[PDB]
Amino acid sequence: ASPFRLASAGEISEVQGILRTAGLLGPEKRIAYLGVLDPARGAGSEAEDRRFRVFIHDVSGARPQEVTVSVTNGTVISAVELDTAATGELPVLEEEFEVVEQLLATDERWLKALAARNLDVSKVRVAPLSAGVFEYAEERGRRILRGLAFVQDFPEDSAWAHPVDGLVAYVDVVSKEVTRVIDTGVFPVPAEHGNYTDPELTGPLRTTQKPISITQPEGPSFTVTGGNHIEWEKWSLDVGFDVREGVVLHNIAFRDGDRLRPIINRASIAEMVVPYGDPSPIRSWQNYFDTGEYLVGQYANSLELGCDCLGDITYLSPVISDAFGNPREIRNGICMHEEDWGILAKHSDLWSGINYTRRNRRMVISFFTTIGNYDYGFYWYLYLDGTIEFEAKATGVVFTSAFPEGGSDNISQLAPGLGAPFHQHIFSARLDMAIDGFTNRVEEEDVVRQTMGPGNERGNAFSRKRTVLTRESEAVREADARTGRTWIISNPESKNRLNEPVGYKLHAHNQPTLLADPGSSIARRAAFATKDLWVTRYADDERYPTGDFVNQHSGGAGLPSYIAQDRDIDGQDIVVWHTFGLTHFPRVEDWPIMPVDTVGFKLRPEGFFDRSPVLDVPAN
Amino acid sequence: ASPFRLASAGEISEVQGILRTAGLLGPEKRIAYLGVLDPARGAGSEAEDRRFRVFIHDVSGARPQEVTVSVTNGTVISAVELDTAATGELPVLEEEFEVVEQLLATDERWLKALAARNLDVSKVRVAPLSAGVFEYAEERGRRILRGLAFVQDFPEDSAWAHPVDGLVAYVDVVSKEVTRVIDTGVFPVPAEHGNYTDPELTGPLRTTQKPISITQPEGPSFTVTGGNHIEWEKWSLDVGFDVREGVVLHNIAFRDGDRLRPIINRASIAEMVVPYGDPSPIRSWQNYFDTGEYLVGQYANSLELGCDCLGDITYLSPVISDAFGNPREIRNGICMHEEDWGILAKHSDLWSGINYTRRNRRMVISFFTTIGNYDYGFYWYLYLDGTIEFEAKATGVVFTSAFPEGGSDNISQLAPGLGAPFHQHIFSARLDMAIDGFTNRVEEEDVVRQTMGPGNERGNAFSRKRTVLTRESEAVREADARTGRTWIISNPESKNRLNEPVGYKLHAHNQPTLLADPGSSIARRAAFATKDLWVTRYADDERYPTGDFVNQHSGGAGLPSYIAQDRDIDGQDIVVWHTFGLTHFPRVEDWPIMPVDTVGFKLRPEGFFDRSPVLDVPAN
Ligand SMILES: [NH3+]CCc1ccccc1
């Protein structure tokens, strides 16, 4: 009954039928993106209109189309031809991954480069890398992928251990032309293997780990109704899934007594970028937006019980469309479980004699995605005390290069001859806030140091200051760890029992933002990544910090264009966009497969409740 | 057999006997501190000399004594009379907690202040707060406590909800004189109770939490030998316990193949300070060093199975001395267990077809302490991949005041009439490093941004720079979150297979340091807390960042005096002191008992190993 339910196989088949009947999905068409649209502001009409947005690619070279479909009424709502030279290309198709390698294997310039290196072309894998926008005028309006090569000594070999440096090719995947092959010189192909399942590399496996058993003899404390509605320890929310963003959280709310209080209308990771800091011409163009260009949701793993998710696990299996509009299930794509989380609160009082201890727990909602060499886990946590936390776990295999003779200022050496270019992993969380409703505002809170003097004779005082962000033009903010800077989202029209506005405080990790030169192509295309915090006024069509079509867009779309409208955000329907990321100088310990590193953020109640919300938690 | 074993009841009884026989422990003497001394550098003689350091207080007013005892040979090694006016007073005695309230209850000025407020003196509890050093010349050389009052409506009432503001008293606890009573005016005593076990406050307890069962059907993967030596997943270490510092980690080392490699010689939290930022004369003197002044180890809780520690738990029960030299056990004072910790490493490879997943776990060593209103958990974590992490968990009851009419810039309002002054909780970790041995150095690592130009035509490059700290005078460092600043401890004489020095990287949380004016008394006494990182050359007697006798020391002892020696630290036996802390602006949700907040730091291998150290972990 819920308009926020997951898309079903039947809905996707109906979309495919509507498009077919309308003449929009013939045999030369491919679906590059398909997703349900959220209800507009004002779904209180209960008139359910399940609408889907579709990006349709044309393999014959005709212009692509953005189509909106009403599955409820069986109609096409709108269909617009896209000018990709102006507004950007469609996301990379899974079926284009092979095309780079296959085209190159019959190009004379590529074959000559391999022959000079004594490489068998049947061993050479080619990574299909997004192109970006640089100095090649001939690429504007064309669908380009760039290719970097790795040697596979045998079919179960890890190709990442054998980069072929000094070589890169550009391919037009629609017209099937190799447009350029660039060979800056021969580098030795690193010879050591990186096969982390080879007993010669691992040695004998440890026998010292004894089992840890986590069970729930009465089952879990959360309930799932309607397929994707979760109720857990006064929290209520809907778990969505989008092929671009992955897991999306809707209608996060907290039952405070008899009253269901909204906190967040929609939470997602709306973009992620991995820019590389190696100035070599072979890789200086390399920045992939795994979300916006590749769509991380369509690469979600099936998660195995007792390996990926441990404990009493409830799964969701989201449905997405393949390139022809057929439904395909991602079996066990989302894991859902609660975890013990240590001490919640504890006091032994010298005067009252009362000893008091309570335990914490958190609800975990997660998925894993794999795009090429990298693997990422996305984890949302809900805590008993009202805290909401996000954590990204980065693992997989680092992207490699040769390590030059005489060293490098921009590459780490991992093994003899083997390098790993410096890079960042930068995320954008899009938080459509609804603190006690939709009239919200953001204040920047700084610690204030005070000088010794009158009214502060002992020089011990310190304070804090809050600055309201009133218009979008002043709502692009930077971190300041030294002054303890945080941001508070409050509802100036809803007060707690002390007559203060209710709020939530955003705690950032204060890691470095985008390091590239502000005049670079990547600074223009990933402008969101240059600042820690952006606040916009809510609009239906402002969904991604980089715009709708990231692939080969020249720059400036998304957040810089949104905030230029300079709209009123003081007690309005607002959206918080938080940039956070890891700066990765690879270490020897990251090779041949990298242990998880993490980054994220959290939101804690700030006078949202009238006292601690966990006084009613029982003793274990 | 190990010189790092825990003190036993028999050893403490022998210390008591040696002191008695030597004439040093008559009936007017009290032991204010007793602890075993670590072996000197060069214990390879195997000549075990178990030595104990003792601070002996004299209740008759004679000068106190520092005594060193050899329990092995049954001799007093040294006994020095202390000039407390010069070098500081001894730590607060547990038996002095009562004395403040009892003396005040017969003082006419105190009784008059209570009568003006219509307060029953039999209801008024008085907190025994450390005095610091301020403008009262008459306190130099005297053992002073200051008292702040709270009303207990009945014996099981939480007194913290009823602060008596506008009133403070100073007491000489040796001569039993009330030296001053200060009454700046009447404030209403907040009337609401804060009794978090009162069903009228909690409402009916939740029935929705179902059990989480964590068991180890084959027992734990770690072994304990010799009472306190731990072996777990290639880690080896000794767990010590000191009445001042609490849990101390010794000889942390990692078995890399057939070779046992040292990492950290001694790890402890060597100080902690809670400075308050309320400029009111009633509280502007208030800064307690829970470690240095009160000794957090002697207030360690007995931890209950299934409440404080959940899972397959191994306990230690450390032994300490009471004020007369009798052994007393802290039953179940240290919990020890391993925990599942999610995904360790994961990759699904598009070219090799291999799917690979491994799970992480951590070894946990923790204790909890309670000093008055506050409770703290100290957690050390060891991870499979070589990471070492510390986490402090702060909970308990916030220290309260009245909330003034018309508001305050330095106090939060928690309930009608009830305030909580702003404060910080600042810790000092003392890390006696031994990375692959004792020849170590520290480098400060910053991200380096690069400008668009020749050699960086696309403006994408970025790098890093490392600066060696060569002398103590340049080894007082500040955080810089914006440039991603970390610190690497390396051994320039031990190289990994890539011929780079082995190292470990220290990752700080980059929270604000001490906020008080640099000319204040607390900035001088807690100088360690003004900077994030200090490096000293190892010396036997340089144990605490604040000096040996913190109580009523005028300032400058400890780290500023150590680093003034300007010793060589480039490839030497060094000690890293890391300051980290929480800045606490209390929120309504912290009342009436506060949910845990956390802070800490971690160290990760940086080219310590020749590849990932967890390739030999088996599939679950
Ligand atoms: N992660 C997106 C870039 C990529 C895609 C496929 C193989 C290697 C790298």
Ligand SMILES: [NH3+]CCc1ccccc1
């Ligand atoms: N935590 C050390 C200060 C303190 C000691 C006893 C009661 C309240 C406060």
Ligand SMILES: [Cu+2]
């Ligand atoms: Cu990385």
Ligand SMILES: [Cu+2]
């Ligand atoms: Cu606090």
Ligand code: NA
């Ligand atoms: Na909003």
Ligand code: NA
């Ligand atoms: Na050392």
